[PDB]
Amino acid sequence: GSHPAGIILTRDSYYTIPSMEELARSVDENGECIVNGFTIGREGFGSIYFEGIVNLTNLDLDSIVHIRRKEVIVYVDDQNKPPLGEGLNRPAQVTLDEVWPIDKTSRCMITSPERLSEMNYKSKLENASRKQGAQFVDYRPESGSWVFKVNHF
Amino acid sequence: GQVQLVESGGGLVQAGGSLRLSCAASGRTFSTYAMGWFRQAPGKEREFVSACSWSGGITRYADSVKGRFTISRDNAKNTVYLQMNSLKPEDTAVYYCASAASSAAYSGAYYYTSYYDYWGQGTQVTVSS
Ligand code: NA
């Protein structure tokens, strides 16, 4: 008696939009779970929003998605990653929280919006997004929330 | 130039055979967040081949080499390897090893040449028919 869409998500810090409970009610007569827009996140850490029509049937989200501090991995081992556009290997908007510059000499982080603007931290995140093949979207300094768009994982 | 990479092990191999490339990393090697292999064939652009995180726990391969190539690294020796199996003439290229000194915010970062900061000089692989 597992989830009717076959979706595996046991980790209590994670959540989905639509919720796992809604997804249980979003299965068609052939067992397929198909949604328009899908978010998976982890409280305190970040979230990944997939626009468009997404087929979630039998996704082991526990195996596939890992949202850690300042890092997301979607498919750990490469052989489990489907072709571009399938499963979760597709365009998405990544939000990572608590992304703040470290003072490696004072070993503490700079988190005030005043200082983040004084040091133009936002432009570092813009360059880092481009460097990694992504498109910078936003930075919310209070929460250190770095948002950027990716074409694949 | 705070990390230096020197590849070795290139050579001529018959189609279907195997070849293992090596790369020796020097300098501030604990800087590295990722190691990768790229290749450039004559007249074409430099293209992604393979990558792993520093830990070796996450791996990425080009579709063309999935299941034939295996990247690995030895952090006792500060060496990086590319095991190349079932080689084809389309695998003929100069192979470069590269290292990234910043973390991958998302697991697709590994595919991009811009993500890597230090580069070896390359070693030549030639696969005969
Ligand atoms: Na997001």
Numbering used by the authors:
A (entry chain B): 714 to 866
B (entry chain A): 1 to 129
Anything the authors wrote about it?
Nucleocytoplasmic transport proceeds through NE-embedded nuclear pore complexes. With a molecular mass of around 120 MDa and an outer diameter of ~120 nm in higher eukaryotes, NPCs are among the cells’ largest protein complexes. Nanobodies (Nbs) are the isolated variable domains of heavy chain-only IgGs. Using a selection strategy against conserved epitopes, we obtained anti-Nup93, Nup98, and Nup155 nanobodies that block Nup–Nup interfaces and arrest NPC assembly.
We have now characterized three nanobodies against the Nup98-APD. One of them (xNup98-Nb1t) stains intact NPCs, permits normal NPC biogenesis, and allows tracking of the assembly process. By contrast, xhNup98-Nb2i and -Nb3i are inhibitory and cause a severe and early NPC assembly defect—comparable to a block of Nup155 (EV5, and EV6). To understand this difference, we solved their crystal structures in complex with the Nup98-APD.Figure 11 xhNup98-Nb2i and Nb3i recognize a conserved APD region and block the Nup98–Nup96 and Nup98–Nup88 interactions. The obtained structures show that the inhibitory nanobodies xhNup98-Nb2i and -Nb3i each recognize overlapping epitopes. Both inhibitory epitopes also overlap with the binding sites of the Nup98-APD for Nup96 and Nup88, suggesting that these nanobodies fully block these interactions. Surprisingly, however, the same scaffold phenotype was caused by anti-Nup98 nanobodies targeting its autoproteolytic domain and blocking interactions with Nup96 and the Nup88 β-propeller.
